[PDB]
Amino acid sequence: DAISMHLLKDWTDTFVYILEKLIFDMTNHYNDSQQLRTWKRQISYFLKLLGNCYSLRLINKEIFHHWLVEFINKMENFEFLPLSLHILMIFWNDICQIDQKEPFFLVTKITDMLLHKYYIVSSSKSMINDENYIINDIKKNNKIKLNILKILSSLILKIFQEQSLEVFIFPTSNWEIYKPLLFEIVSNADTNQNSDMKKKLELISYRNESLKNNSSIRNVIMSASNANDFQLTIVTCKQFPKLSCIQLNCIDTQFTKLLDDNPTEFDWPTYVDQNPLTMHKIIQLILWSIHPSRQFDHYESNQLVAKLLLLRINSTDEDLHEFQIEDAIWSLV
Amino acid sequence: ASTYRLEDVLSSFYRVEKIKKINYHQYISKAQNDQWSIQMEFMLRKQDPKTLVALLSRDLWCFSINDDPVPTPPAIEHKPVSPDKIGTFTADYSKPNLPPHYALFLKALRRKIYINLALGSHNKLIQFGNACISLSGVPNYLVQLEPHLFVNGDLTVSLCAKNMGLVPMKEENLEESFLSKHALYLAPSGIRMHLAPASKQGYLITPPKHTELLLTTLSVSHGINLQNKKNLKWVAVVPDLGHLNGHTPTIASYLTPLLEAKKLVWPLHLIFAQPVADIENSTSGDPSEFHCLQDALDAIDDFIQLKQSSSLPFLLRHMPLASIPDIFITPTPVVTISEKEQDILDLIAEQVVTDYNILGNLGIPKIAYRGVKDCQEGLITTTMLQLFSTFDRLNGNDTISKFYNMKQPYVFVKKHHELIKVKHDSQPFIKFLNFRPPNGIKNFKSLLLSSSFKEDCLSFAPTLSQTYINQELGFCELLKLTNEDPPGLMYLKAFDKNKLLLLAAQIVSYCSNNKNSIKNVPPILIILPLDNATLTELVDKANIFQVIKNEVCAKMPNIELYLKVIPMDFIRNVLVTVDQYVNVAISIYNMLPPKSVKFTHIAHTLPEKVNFRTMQQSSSIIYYDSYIHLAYSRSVDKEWVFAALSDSYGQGSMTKTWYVGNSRGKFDDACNQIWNIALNLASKKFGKICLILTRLNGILPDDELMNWRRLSGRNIHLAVVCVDDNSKISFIDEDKLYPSFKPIYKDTRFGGRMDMTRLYDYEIRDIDQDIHGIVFQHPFPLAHSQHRCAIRSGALIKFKKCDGDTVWDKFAVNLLNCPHSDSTQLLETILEEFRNLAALNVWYGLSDGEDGHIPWHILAVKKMMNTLVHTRVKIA
Amino acid sequence: SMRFQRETSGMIVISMENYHLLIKIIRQLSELNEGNLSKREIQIDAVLKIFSFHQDSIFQRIIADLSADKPTSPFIDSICKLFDKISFNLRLKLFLYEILSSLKSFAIYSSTIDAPAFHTSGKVELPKKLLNLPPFQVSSFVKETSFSLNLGIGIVEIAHENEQKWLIYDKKDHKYVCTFSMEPYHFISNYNTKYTDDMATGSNDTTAFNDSCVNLSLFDARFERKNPH
């Protein structure tokens, strides 16, 4: 009995081989407009024959779809995209309509792949060779790119309309944002997609427990005064200025920070409001010979924050707060 | 081997009583009393809600069950009122037309049940008129309790669950977005109404001090008295008087206001809405035109380029829920006719009645009665066990008398050049057996006429002509003009008057060229692609073809062209197999001018038992020789009349439609023409011939019955039949052993055995076309029209190809007027003809393999009255 | 408490240990108290939810609870299950996050039950109630965002039909037997025939007549021949 399944898998293999061969023969031949006029009816006739064989159960439908998602995932030059995406749109009624996890695997794979292709298309220019002269005139380039952006936008829109399960957990790249920029455009702010997007930002963004962070909202412009304990006074112990936030892991990182690329990594964590103020204290408090570059490092950290400025608020003041803290030191004496 | 366990197949009839006598008093409305009956009825109901009472317009009828005496109303301090007639009856009345005390006992029992059910619940459920819909949206369907009394005295109630979209509305809906596209309804009556325009307040006003008395009356009828509720929003309504008299408005153009009677005030807590079902083109296939492959070739071409006392009529009357339509669509296109020219409607019926599902059932899907599985848990069991004696459902063995499996009828087909019979379950193998029609070939010349995408219709038209030639069905030598156009095509744009005139001039120049030829070589047809499979563009393509025929006929007569429509998706979907165009080819072969000769008909085999007719037994039995079937229907609004006529083997088929309109002279004209065509077919057969006219959709009113009783006589013997398609009575099957496709569907290994290919005498028996006939033990009530029950009810029943307990599809036949005696023999003969007429419906292009239980002419009438009532007509 | 408990949980995770102390009495009591009053749940909802979530964060306690139900005799109700149901009913609009946590916990519980049922099935019958409450699609998702109206009319649902129309009738024993299914490379329009001769060649020459890609006796293909008049 398995001989029939063997034969069916083998014919599916040679069919997808010949389709890949023709799609690459496009760019491996295109220099003559009489050959292109032949090639257009060639791809149209082969797509007609492939559909007529696919609707007759002569092609194993589950290896072909996996090869298809691999083929749209693996491509890197954009001059195959408008035909391969049309091939995707043909079997769109059978890929995403399946009613790590084996079930509904092509749907999540297809939306991860389509968002990645959206990002790579929205990154740069359409030409990939950059080896010949007069590379780009800007107008035809933007005219081509807007079409592919429109196609991918409509496909992501139908993905979000389709799946009622709605599991877009991304295990590879955690939450890069392009989809609010899509969903602002359509429907003129229809609140169902908005509420689903808020539940999406709750679920798929991997929100940390952040018990301490709940406390952070309370923090305002606040200062620090250190007062010696009565017991401490007898032993002449010195009080350590109080801190709104610990960021102890951050403190630990600072000690081993030297001779490593710490600056790019901190950027990832938005601790500028609390950690930067805390960092100043650390630089001031314990290194005479331990951290020779500590003040300079602190300046670099502050400088990085200064460079990454988007608003007047909570930027210029930081300096004012630092001045107040310095003034506070005088008060303590 | 029908070893069906007749016990434990659950019906929908809950037995509630046991009746051997029922007594009644009728108090006539003597001497034109000052609304004495209307006052004294609610004055009698205020004492106790257990009484059985009803009222004709001013006459009073009090009833009493088996033993207890009838109540007497509270009269004046001296009593001069005596009852007008005392009587009693039993469970054997005049069955084919109900006497007017049983049709009042049923209304009294239904009113008592709905009032007691409304009072027992927590004021959350009112009678909508043959319904009980909750004020909150908890069920979101209509529960319908229908009482009936059988012939042995078994007073049962049948339960129905109609899934209509009746949603209650509130104060936060009185805006344009809701009132623009909803149809409103008055809740304890069932009349439809529109809101009166506002009074500078915002569509709600304070109640006047008089009409709050109406709320007190709601404590005595319908039992939902919200006098304790501290908030109550009142609104100003106005109903349509025609719907007060059964005349539902024109369903083609709903939501249009009409003249008023007088304003009224009504609580907004009980006013319901019905939503306009909408239609769109499609989804999932890029309607923004990237599924067009030439867009992809355009983008790769750009890359190539870059590479360089005012409410008592509303508190007393009720509407029987058949006079409110199930669905009504939004766009509502307009067709036009004359006072002698009925051509476009017959054209649309001709080209929608014989296409399989390629049109797609272009409107909205059906609203059918979902079947009840059980009712053991809730509140209506408690209220019935409180109100009555018992409450348990009837088994299969109490109602079903005769259960038997029907045979498989044969059909004619030509294999090589022999003319062989074959089973009717062999339609999709028609290409893989080289089957060819027995009745000869029909020939034409084709002309596709597209304007959307030329590069795909160029590939579509020669392969359709080649698959029509390649089976021996005649020669479709497709049309060819002088210029560079590929043959059988004219890629135009902007379908309009001037281009259609020039195309008609081109075709008439071709016809003037080809002068001398035979008559049967030139019929031509035009194929038009529907850009969107809906109704609004089907009627426009019909208009375009009618303009072409009008401009061709006046320049040259005797030319006969036809219209075929095909959806654009079926042209440009690349998943359309070439094993499918074959069916489309047959859907041209049933339109060519030999119209009433089609692909195949029933084989007319030898009988199974000979049974030489000697001396009788000598009663008035007939033993007819040739039946004639006819199915006519009339829409809910009283305009459209549809009809289909067929032989006992499906030979002399006619399908027609008549837009009568509001009048009643065209209706008598159409009912005369139906009998004209029936007698025209009747003057072809032997003699002793009995025509069987079947009224669709349950209800058989009195005007059509007056017409058919005037027209009939000794020219032919009729036999009226009422037909029901939707499962209002819902037998739910529950067994695991008899239908032997269920062990093969349970695990696909239970039977699972080898064929033992030395016993090789088998047959491929396609399920969904294995119908089982039932003849019930007792007559059944019709699904609508509580004025006439039936005699000798029966049914065709088709199982579902699945395992386990589920409802089965059914087709209920109800005999109403038998010509001779022994009506059970006539019912079994009607079922044995109906099975053949149901098996014919796949070979004709009427539907796909979805209903092998409905006979083909009734399915044709149902498709016409499903997809043709929605167009509105103007007479010019 | 959350900070200390959170730190302990982190250490346990780091220690690669799912082991936890058993205090069945306290968690159940807290759940019952929260479930009883809507207003009580509303006040300080975040603190209560965070604590409960931490307690159920670990699957160690949950697995143990499942075992007891299998172990317990008959159909006796589970206190923990009841508390969870009450919380699910009760926890409406408390917080955007609270709802997510509750949904996640419910989903996790069903998965745990499924994992537990890997051997022969110990019957619980509370899964359907639990399954209905948490869903990732349609109306149920929105749902996350009756006095006496119990009709109990129990309407039927659409049961999906299988995809094999064609079966085979065994006309001897009078029963259906097997699904007729040829692979779709069998239905070829056959042209290599040898019936270009005339009919009535000898007698009973149906061997060169019945050639197609189905035997004609699988439809009861009867000839028709009469002496015409």
**Cα distance from N-terminal residue to C-terminal residue, chain B:** 63
**Cross-strand partners of B691:** B628, B718
> How far is Cα B434 from Cα B430, in angstroms, rounded to an integer?
6
For A71, other C-beta atoms within 10 Å of its C-beta total: 17
Sign of CA dihedral B181, B185, B191, B197: negative
The vertex-C174 CA angle with C169 and C178, nearest 5°, equals: 35
Neighbours of chain C (3+ CB pairs under 8 A): A, B
Helices (runs of H) and strands (runs of E) counted in chain C: 9, 2
Closest CA to B348 of B339, B337, B338: B337
**Cross-strand partners of B62:** B25, B53
Across the interface, do B121 and C172 touch by the CB < 8 Å criterion?
no
> How far is Cα C88 from Cα C99, in angstroms, rounded to an integer?
9
Neighbours of chain B (3+ CB pairs under 8 A): A, C
Residue of chain B whose Cα is closest to the Cα of A159: B284
Q: What is the number of alpha carbons within 13 Å of residue B66 lying toward its C-beta?
A: 10
Closest CB to B299 among A90, A141, A144? A144
- The answer for B237, left when phi > 0, alpha when psi is -120 to 50, beta otherwise, is beta
Q: Min CA distance, B153 vs chain C (Å)? A: 26
Phi and psi of B522, rounded to 5°?
-95, 10
Across the interface, do C171 and B761 touch by the CB < 8 Å criterion?
yes
Which two three-digit tokens encode residue B787? 């004025």
Across the interface, do A166 and C96 touch by the CB < 8 Å criterion?
no
> How far is Cα B109 from Cα B61, in angstroms, rounded to an integer?
12
The pairing of beta strand B640-647 with beta strand B626-634: antiparallel
Which two three-digit tokens encode residue B370? 């979902």
A195 at C interface, C-beta within 8 A = yes
Q: Which of A35, A79, A97 to mutate to test the interface with B (most CBs of B within 10 A)?
A: A79
For B848, other C-beta atoms within 10 Å of its C-beta total: 14
Across the interface, do A166 and C141 touch by the CB < 8 Å criterion?
yes
Which two three-digit tokens encode residue B103? 């049709």
Across the interface, do C100 and A199 touch by the CB < 8 Å criterion?
yes
> How far is Cα C197 from Cα A42, in angstroms, rounded to an integer?
43
Across the interface, do B371 and C156 touch by the CB < 8 Å criterion?
yes
CA dihedral C88, C89, C93, C95 (to 10 degrees): -20
Across the interface, do B379 and C159 touch by the CB < 8 Å criterion?
no
Three-class SS string for B495-542? CCHHHHHHHHHHHHHHHHHCCCCCCCCCCEEEEEEECCCCCCCHHHHH
Q: Min CA distance, A47 vs chain B (Å)? A: 7
The pairing of beta strand B155-162 with beta strand B142-149: antiparallel
Residue of chain A whose Cα is closest to the Cα of C138: A164
Which two three-digit tokens encode residue B179? 């009132």
Closest CA to C213 of B426, A208, B130, B11: B426
- Please list every residue in chain C whose beta carbon sits closer than 8 Å to the beta carbon of residue A195: 145
- Please list every residue in chain A whose beta carbon sits closer than 8 Å to the beta carbon of residue C106: none
- Judge residue B844's burial from the number of C-beta atoms within 10 Å of its C-beta, 0-12 exposed, 13-18 middle, 19 or more buried: buried
> How far is Cα B163 from Cα B181, in angstroms, rounded to an integer?
19
Closest CB to C50 among A166, A207, A211? A211
Burial C76-91 (b: 16+ CB within 10 A, else e): eebbbbebbbbbbebb
Closest CA to B159 of B148, B174, B175: B148
Cβ contact B701:B785 at 8 Å: yes
C138 at B interface, C-beta within 8 A = no
Across the interface, do B124 and C149 touch by the CB < 8 Å criterion?
yes
Q: Min CA distance, B2 vs chain C (Å)? A: 9
The pairing of beta strand B22-27 with beta strand B60-64: antiparallel
- Judge residue A45's burial from the number of C-beta atoms within 10 Å of its C-beta, 0-12 exposed, 13-18 middle, 19 or more buried: exposed
Q: Min CA distance, C11 vs chain A (Å)? A: 15
Burial B1-34 (b: 16+ CB within 10 A, else e): eeebebeebbbbbbbbbebeebbbbbbebeeeee
> How far is Cα A176 from Cα A191, in angstroms, rounded to an integer?
22
Within 8 A by CB and 6+ apart from B464, the residues are: B446, B581, B584, B585
Q: What is the edge-to-edge ordering of all strands in the sheet holding B264-267?
A: B167-168, B271-275, B182-186, B192-195, B234-239, B264-267
Helix (H) or strand (E) holding B868: none
A61 at C interface, C-beta within 8 A = no
For A259, other C-beta atoms within 10 Å of its C-beta total: 6
Across the interface, do B378 and C171 touch by the CB < 8 Å criterion?
no
- Judge residue B802's burial from the number of C-beta atoms within 10 Å of its C-beta, 0-12 exposed, 13-18 middle, 19 or more buried: middle
Name residue C69's amino acid.
D
Residue of chain B whose Cα is closest to the Cα of A23: B300
Closest CB to A82 among B285, B296, B455? B296
Across the interface, do C167 and B373 touch by the CB < 8 Å criterion?
no
Name residue B279's amino acid.
I
What's the Rg (C-alpha) of chain C? Answer: 33
- Please list every residue in chain A whose beta carbon sits closer than 8 Å to the beta carbon of residue B304: 30, 36
**Cross-strand partners of B656:** B643
Residue of chain B whose Cα is closest to the Cα of C166: B766
Across the interface, do C152 and B380 touch by the CB < 8 Å criterion?
yes
Q: Which of B126, B414, B580, B764 to mutate to test the interface with C (most CBs of C within 10 A)?
A: B764
Closest CB to B432 among C177, C214, C219? C214
- Judge residue B75's burial from the number of C-beta atoms within 10 Å of its C-beta, 0-12 exposed, 13-18 middle, 19 or more buried: exposed
Q: What is the largest CA-CA distance in chain C?
A: 106
Cβ contact A277:A321 at 8 Å: yes
CA A310 to chain centroid, in Å, comes to 20
**Cross-strand partners of B645:** B630, B654
List the alpha helices (DSSP H) in chain A: 2-27, 33-54, 61-74, 81-90, 92-95, 105-123, 138-162, 179-183, 191-203, 211-218, 230-234, 248-256, 262-266, 275-286, 294-307, 316-332
List the alpha helices (DSSP H) in chain C: 2-14, 24-36, 38-42, 45-57, 59-69, 79-90, 96-114, 127-132, 139-144
Sign of CA dihedral C39, C45, C48, C52: positive
Within 8 A by CB and 6+ apart from B672, the residues are: B711
| Helix, coil or strand: residue B604 | coil
A165 at C interface, C-beta within 8 A = yes
Across the interface, do A164 and C141 touch by the CB < 8 Å criterion?
yes
Q: Min CA distance, A133 vs chain C (Å)? A: 53
Name residue C130's amino acid.
L
Which two three-digit tokens encode residue A215? 């406390």
Name residue A276's amino acid.
P
> How far is Cα B628 from Cα B620, in angstroms, rounded to an integer?
21
Return the number of CB contacts < 8 Å for A and B: 78
The vertex-B391 CA angle with B387 and B396, nearest 5°, equals: 155
Across the interface, do C184 and A195 touch by the CB < 8 Å criterion?
no
Q: What is the number of alpha carbons within 13 Å of residue B411 lying toward its C-beta?
A: 28
Closest CA to B599 of B807, B250, B352, B356: B356
CA A158 to chain centroid, in Å, comes to 20
Residue of chain A whose Cα is closest to the Cα of B306: A140
Closest CA to B632 of B600, B651, B660: B660
> How far is Cα B8 from Cα A195, in angstroms, rounded to an integer?
49
> How far is Cα B621 from Cα B615, in angstroms, rounded to an integer?
11
Q: What is the number of alpha carbons within 13 Å of residue C152 lying toward its C-beta?
A: 13
Across the interface, do A144 and B306 touch by the CB < 8 Å criterion?
yes
The pairing of beta strand B791-798 with beta strand B772-776: antiparallel
Cβ contact B416:C216 at 8 Å: no
- Judge residue B615's burial from the number of C-beta atoms within 10 Å of its C-beta, 0-12 exposed, 13-18 middle, 19 or more buried: exposed
DSSP code per residue over B333-401 = -EEEE-SS---HHHHHHHHHTT--SSS---S-----BPPB----SSSHHHHHHHHSS--EE--HHHHEE
> How far is Cα C17 from Cα C15, in angstroms, rounded to an integer?
5
Within 8 A by CB and 6+ apart from A315, the residues are: A305, A306, A309
**Cross-strand partners of B238:** B194
DSSP code per residue over B270-323 = SEEEEE-B---S-SSS-TTTTSSHHHHHHHHHHHHHHT---SHHHHH----SSS
Q: Min CA distance, A160 vs chain B (Å)? A: 13
Closest CA to B326 of B696, B704, B870: B870
Resolution, in Å, please?
A: 4.4
Across the interface, do A55 and B576 touch by the CB < 8 Å criterion?
yes
DSSP code per residue over C3-66 = HHHHHHHHHHHHTT-------HHHHHHHHHHHHH-HHHHHTTHHHHHHHHHHHHHSHHHHHHHH
- Please list every residue in chain B whose beta carbon sits closer than 8 Å to the beta carbon of residue C176: 740-741, 744, 751, 765
Three-class SS string for B417-484? CCEEEEECCCCCCCCCCCCECCCCCCCEEEEECCCCCHHHHHHHHHHHHHHHHCCCCCCECCCCCCCC
